[PDB]
Amino acid sequence: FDPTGYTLAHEHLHIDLSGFKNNVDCRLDQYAFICQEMNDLMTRGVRNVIEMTNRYMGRNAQFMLDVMRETGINVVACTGYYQDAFFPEHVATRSVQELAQEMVDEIEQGIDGTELKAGIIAEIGTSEGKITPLEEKVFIAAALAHNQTGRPISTHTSFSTMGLEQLALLQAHGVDLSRVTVGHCDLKDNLDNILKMIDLGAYVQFDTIGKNSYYPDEKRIAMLHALRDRGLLNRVMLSMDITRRSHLKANGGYGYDYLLTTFIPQLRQSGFSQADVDVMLRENPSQFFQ
Ligand SMILES: [Zn+2]
Ligand SMILES: [Zn+2]
């Protein structure tokens, strides 16, 4: 991790949900295209990408090591379990302590039989409008792993729900909330809960920039303005959450660097300063991910 560079707080470089979703677009494995995307990011000052694909989402450590070697970008890999509909059957049968020890080993020993080690517990998720019993179990296991290793936790919210409940659960199990960042806060008008999450001590992410099907970038910007008016940009981080082949520029998509080429300039034009952007893209991630 290079704290002098910009950081994308929630991205995938190799993820394969094509089996779960019966959809080849969800097999993001196009190495040559992704290397070019990483080079594109570097050219605009992004030097860190926090990679959110844990083991059973189709993580590929060797692929990530190869991307770093080809491009020089820093990738922080993760350990964890995703969300209820996607868990392997063994999440149910193994104990909390066993799931925790798995994450600890991925942080301390390495992942996928390589020299690469997990640097964050992520993206650990909850379902839409509820936390299932197995999701609670994963979160409790994540808390244990965080306590043993000190690595921060990055979550998944489904349709921007249950963030406050995730925080309450993690805190109850000894996680200081300054070590938690809540994913996908920008899929709906969500200001009231965002303000409560920031007040509790957590970081929040607008990590679905460009996903306008779900919710317009225009409204993301308005929320960011509300946060800026309140002096809370020091707890906000941004990303694209690239997850699909169709998101890549080589496939006609907007790509990872859309954040810099398109979204940030809209943000600037709407009244943000260079300093405001540096806070969200450099200072916050350097504070949080190290
Ligand atoms: Zn997610
Ligand atoms: Zn993701």
Q: Check whether 201 is labelled as a binding-site residue.
A: no
Query: Which technique was the structure solved with, according to the deposited record?
Result: X-ray
Residue 157 CA to ligand 1 centre (angstroms): 6
- The two structure tokens encoding residue 93: 């049968």
**Closest ligand, as measured to the CA of 158:** 1
Structural domain boundaries in the chain? 1-290
Burial class (CB in 10 A: 0-12, 13-18, 19+), 32: exposed
Ligand nearest to the CA of 124: 1
- What Å resolution does this PDB entry report? 1.8
Q: Which residues pair with 181 in a beta bridge?
A: 154, 203
Q: Which residue shows structure tokens 């709906």? A: 188
Q: Which residues of 261-285 are buried (b: 16+ CB within 10 A; e: fewer)?
A: eebbeebeeeebeeebbebbbbebb
Among 20, 33, 47, smallest CA distance to 247 is for: 33
257 is in an annotated binding site: no
Task: Of 101, 111, 99, give the one whose Cα is nearest residue 136.
Answer: 99
Ligand 2 centroid to Cα of residue 181, in Å, is 13
Known binder of ligand: residue 184? yes
DSSP 13: S
| φ, ψ for residue 243, nearest 5 deg | -135, -10
Residue spans of beta strands (DSSP E) within the chain: 6-11, 15-16, 27-28, 46-51, 74-79, 118-125, 153-156, 180-182, 203-206, 236-238
Q: What does the block give as tokens for 147?
A: 């306590």
282 is in an annotated binding site: yes
Spatial neighbors of 3 by CB under 8 A, at least 6 apart, are 282, 286, 290
Alpha-carbon span 37 to 43, nearest angstrom = 10
Check whether 173 is labelled as a binding-site residue: no
Choose among 46, 34, 68: nearest CA to 261: 46
- Ligand 2 midpoint to CA 240 (Å): 9
- Strand 46-51, strand 74-79: pairing: parallel
Alpha carbon of 274 to ligand 1 centroid (Å): 28
Q: Ligand 2 centroid to 206 CA: how many Å?
A: 12
| Ligand 2 mean position, distance from CA 12 (Å) | 6
Using CA of residue 268, residue 270, residue 273, residue 279, what is the dihedral sign? negative
How crowded is residue 79: how many other Cβ atoms within 10 Å of its Cβ? 25
Ligand closest to 240 (CA) is 2
Among 148, 192, 184, 188, which residue's Cα sits nearest to residue 166?
184
| Beta carbons of 228 and 276 less than 8 angstroms apart | yes
Superfamily of the domain at 1-290: Metal-dependent hydrolases (3.20.20.140)
What's the 209 CA to ligand 2 centre distance in angstroms? Answer: 12
Beta strands in 3-140 (DSSP E): 6-11, 15-16, 27-28, 46-51, 74-79, 118-125
Residue among 261, 209, 260, 245 nearest 32 (CA): 245
What are phi and psi for residue 288, nearest 5 degrees? -85, -45
| The two structure tokens encoding residue 90 | 């063994």
Find out whether 225 is annotated in a ligand binding site: no
> Rounded CA gap, 147 and 174, in Å?
7
- 229 belongs to an annotated ligand binding site: no
**Ligand nearest to C-alpha 183:** 1
Cα–Cα dist 78/92, whole Å:
21
Where do we find the tokens 């992410």?
205
- Gap between the Cα atoms of 231 and 189, Å rounded: 19
How far, in Å, is the centroid of ligand 1 from the Cα of 156?
4
8 A C-beta contact, residue 68 and residue 75: yes
Token pair of 146 as six digits: 């965080």
**CA–CA separation, 276 vs 283, rounded Å?**
10
Per the annotation, does 90 bind a ligand?
no
